[PDB]
Design an enzyme around this catalytic site. Sequence first.
Site, short mmCIF file in Angstrom:
data_model
loop_
_atom_site.label_atom_id
_atom_site.label_comp_id
_atom_site.label_asym_id
_atom_site.label_seq_id
_atom_site.Cartn_x
_atom_site.Cartn_y
_atom_site.Cartn_z
N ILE A 260 0.83 -1.20 0.00
CA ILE A 260 0.00 0.00 0.00
C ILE A 260 0.88 1.27 0.00
O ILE A 260 0.49 2.25 -0.64
CB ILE A 260 -1.10 0.04 1.12
CG1 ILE A 260 -0.53 -0.15 2.54
CG2 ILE A 260 -2.26 -0.92 0.81
CD1 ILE A 260 -1.48 0.19 3.72
N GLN B 250 10.55 7.51 4.03
CA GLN B 250 11.17 6.66 5.06
C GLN B 250 10.10 5.78 5.72
O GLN B 250 9.35 6.26 6.59
CB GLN B 250 11.91 7.51 6.11
CG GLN B 250 12.97 6.76 6.92
CD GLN B 250 13.46 7.57 8.11
OE1 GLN B 250 13.78 8.76 8.01
NE2 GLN B 250 13.57 6.92 9.26
N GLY B 251 10.03 4.52 5.29
CA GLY B 251 9.09 3.54 5.83
C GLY B 251 8.29 2.80 4.77
O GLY B 251 7.67 3.41 3.89
N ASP C 36 4.34 19.96 10.92
CA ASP C 36 4.45 19.45 9.55
C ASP C 36 3.23 18.62 9.15
O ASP C 36 3.35 17.52 8.59
CB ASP C 36 5.75 18.69 9.32
CG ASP C 36 6.20 18.68 7.86
OD1 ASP C 36 5.80 19.60 7.10
OD2 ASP C 36 6.99 17.79 7.48
C1 LIG Z 1 0.22 13.26 -1.24
C2 LIG Z 1 1.03 11.99 -1.02
C3 LIG Z 1 1.03 11.11 -2.25
O1 LIG Z 1 1.97 11.16 -3.03
N1 LIG Z 1 -0.03 10.26 -2.49
C4 LIG Z 1 -0.11 9.18 -1.58
C5 LIG Z 1 -1.19 8.29 -1.69
C6 LIG Z 1 -1.31 7.21 -0.81
C7 LIG Z 1 -0.34 6.99 0.16
C8 LIG Z 1 -0.47 5.83 1.11
O2 LIG Z 1 0.26 4.85 1.00
N2 LIG Z 1 -1.41 5.89 2.11
C9 LIG Z 1 -2.40 4.88 2.04
C10 LIG Z 1 -2.86 4.37 0.83
C11 LIG Z 1 -3.84 3.36 0.83
C12 LIG Z 1 -4.37 2.87 2.03
C13 LIG Z 1 -3.93 3.40 3.26
N3 LIG Z 1 -4.46 2.89 4.48
C14 LIG Z 1 -3.63 2.97 5.63
N4 LIG Z 1 -4.15 2.60 6.84
C15 LIG Z 1 -3.45 2.68 7.98
C16 LIG Z 1 -2.13 3.13 7.95
C17 LIG Z 1 -1.59 3.48 6.72
C18 LIG Z 1 -0.21 4.04 6.63
C19 LIG Z 1 0.59 4.11 7.77
C20 LIG Z 1 1.86 4.67 7.65
C21 LIG Z 1 2.29 5.18 6.41
N5 LIG Z 1 1.50 5.10 5.34
C22 LIG Z 1 0.27 4.57 5.42
N6 LIG Z 1 -2.34 3.40 5.59
C23 LIG Z 1 -2.98 4.43 3.23
C24 LIG Z 1 0.73 7.87 0.29
C25 LIG Z 1 0.86 8.95 -0.58
C26 LIG Z 1 1.17 14.42 -0.90
N7 LIG Z 1 0.59 15.47 -0.05
C27 LIG Z 1 1.45 15.68 1.14
C28 LIG Z 1 0.49 16.70 -0.87
#
Ligand SMILES: *[C@H](CC(=O)Nc1ccc(C(=O)Nc2cccc(Nc3nccc(-c4cccnc4)n3)c2)cc1)CN(C)C
EC number: 2.7.11.24
Length: 350
Positions: free
Chosen positions: A26, A31-32, A145
Amino acid sequence: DNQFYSVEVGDSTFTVLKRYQNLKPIGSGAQGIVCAAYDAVLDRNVAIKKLSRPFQNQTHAKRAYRELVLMKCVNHKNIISLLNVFTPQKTLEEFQDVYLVMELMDANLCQVIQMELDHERMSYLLYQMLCGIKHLHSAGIIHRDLKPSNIVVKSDCTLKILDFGLARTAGTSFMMVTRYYRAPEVILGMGYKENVDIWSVGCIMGEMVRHKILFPGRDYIDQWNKVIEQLGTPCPEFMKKLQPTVRNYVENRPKYAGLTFPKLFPDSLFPADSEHNKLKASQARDLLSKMLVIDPAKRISVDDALQHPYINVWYDPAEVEAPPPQIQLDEREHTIEEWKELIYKEVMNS
Ligand SMILES: *[C@H](CC(=O)Nc1ccc(C(=O)Nc2cccc(Nc3nccc(-c4cccnc4)n3)c2)cc1)CN(C)C
């Protein structure tokens, strides 16, 4: 590897407990590495984050210890909670990886932000943001941030903040990629207060309306131009509160009156032809005119924003006035070896 098994997920090796199955990628970066999985023991879907190089340097280790401690101590519906934490390594010597297990959300704010807005969903998302930020501030955590990528949402429109930012530092300095949501007092290094996170909420709201980043730019210099071109040149009083060297550049910029908020966010960007929609367009614009303020002395607080007619429709004392979380520690430096031991004991005693 008795209770553990390995699986390659999105160009990354995940050595996880046998209870987490059907792992699907996903997310990753800056970083991560994150993936989705089914927890057999809880019969629920989770999100598993493998920390990217937590002991590469002290900034990675301080940020990893901070995140692990805060995700454990904080218990608010608008802040992501830690369901589980583990390491496949048996001793402190062998210890190298940390896996954080949290609730799986359906999408990131970065995609939801691109949806055609209704005032009901929009005000609800901002209400939840203001709720989570209020809860962090109560514990002395000023994020500094906040950005759409740091926020996740569910199908039912429930929202959760992923990150804690610079948290307990003092402050206003990050050395690492997306700076479009950082408050002017942070950019220009003036010092911050709690309403520094209100600017970021204003940036996110403006983006929900415009479907375009408010203050884009290759760097801060380009970014500041986008701020003054649109909102106008700040008052001499504000430019006085700057130290002489940055003040010189800021005061030498061409003077801008700034586009009014009706011109910045016209009725065209808002749902039309309804008395309710007409009322809601002016209420949303009014909240933007109070959040998107350069001078933090004139910017609206979290408490007053929650009291605004656009947001107050969701106000629930049980969600807003919830008790703050209490508490090596969160501003003392350590060697990478010393952070590793601090991080290992957190993973083990949970
Ligand atoms: C926008 C950032 C960008 O480039 N677009 C983007 C889309 C999606 C994600 C991403 O991976 N987040 C995501 C996607 C699909 C499902 C989920 N569900 C979720 N549930 C619990 C925890 C997490 C999680 C935890 C830690 C890190 N990432 C996700 N996800 C989440 C990233 C980026 C740029 N703006 C800042 C302008």
